[PDB]
Design an enzyme around this catalytic site. Structure first.
Site, PDB file in Angstrom:
ATOM      1  CG  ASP A  10      31.592  25.388   1.569  1.00 46.87           C
ATOM      2  OD1 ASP A  10      30.454  24.918   1.754  1.00 46.87           O
ATOM      3  OD2 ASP A  10      31.708  26.593   1.151  1.00 46.87           O
ATOM      4  N   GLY A  11      31.071  22.379   1.580  1.00 48.90           N
ATOM      5  CA  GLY A  11      30.335  21.355   0.848  1.00 48.90           C
ATOM      6  C   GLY A  11      29.067  21.938   0.231  1.00 48.90           C
ATOM      7  CD  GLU A  48      27.347  22.785   5.470  1.00 46.10           C
ATOM      8  OE1 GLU A  48      26.593  23.295   6.300  1.00 46.10           O
ATOM      9  OE2 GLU A  48      27.810  23.415   4.478  1.00 46.10           O
ATOM     10  CG  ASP A  70      30.456  27.948   5.366  1.00 49.18           C
ATOM     11  OD1 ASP A  70      31.023  27.006   4.761  1.00 49.18           O
ATOM     12  OD2 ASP A  70      29.271  28.285   5.098  1.00 49.18           O
ATOM     13  CG  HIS A 124      30.900  36.214   3.850  1.00 42.81           C
ATOM     14  ND1 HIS A 124      31.576  37.411   3.730  1.00 42.81           N
ATOM     15  CD2 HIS A 124      30.175  36.289   5.006  1.00 42.81           C
ATOM     16  CE1 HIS A 124      31.260  38.175   4.752  1.00 42.81           C
ATOM     17  NE2 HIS A 124      30.425  37.517   5.541  1.00 42.81           N
ATOM     18  CG  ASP A 134      31.535  27.496  -2.388  1.00 41.51           C
ATOM     19  OD1 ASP A 134      30.718  26.768  -1.831  1.00 41.51           O
ATOM     20  OD2 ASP A 134      31.245  28.269  -3.295  1.00 41.51           O
TER      21      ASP A 134
HETATM   22 MG   LIG Z   1      28.661  24.447   2.427  1.00 40.20          MG
END
Ligand SMILES: [Mg+2]
Length: 155
Positions: A10-11, A48, A70, A124, A134
């Protein structure tokens, strides 16, 4: 033993562009090593990918990696857009460099000396980690130490 590593990524990036942060874990054989850092002003995309990098970038031997993520930038970039680049030179047909090529050319290093399977989660609310990651980006946001020098505000 994680008989060949599962990576999470994530990012977040708080505006567009604003300060960004990358989230990530590498659960190397068994233990787990995490990655975070703040960028004074950046974007979601470059965070990301950013992430997709690092992870790979610190894998010392020839790993078999499950980069679960994701993203629809890093998915859309892999299963679609790269194949054409390498084929053209990382240039449009306009023969105009592509956006972020700087980090793109990179992830493509690391993504060529390892066996990668992409596990493109909607997720998610899946694998603690996709979320862990996240938190880690929101967290590096709030405390940005570095300057995203690849992020060229244009062209
Ligand atoms: Mg992200």
């Amino acid at each position: 033993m994680l008989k060949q590593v599962e990576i999470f990524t994530d990012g977040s990036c708080l505006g567009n562009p604003g300060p960004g942060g990358y989230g990530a874990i590498l659960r190397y054989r068994g233990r787990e090593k995490t990655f975070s850092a703040g960028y004074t002003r950046t974007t979601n995309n470059r965070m990301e990918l950013m992430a997709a990098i690092v992870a790979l970038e610190a894998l010392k031997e020839h790993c078999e990696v499950i980069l679960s993520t994701d993203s629809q930038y890093v998915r859309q970039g892999i299963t679609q857009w790269i194949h054409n680049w390498k084929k053209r030179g990382w240039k449009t047909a306009d023969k105009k460099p592509v956006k972020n090529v700087d980090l793109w050319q990179r992830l493509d290093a690391a993504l060529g000396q390892h066996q990668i399977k992409w596990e493109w989660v909607k997720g998610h609310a899946g694998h603690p980690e996709n979320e862990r990651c996240d938190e880690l980006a929101r967290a590096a946001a709030m405390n940005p130490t570095l300057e995203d020098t690849g992020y060229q505000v244009e062209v």
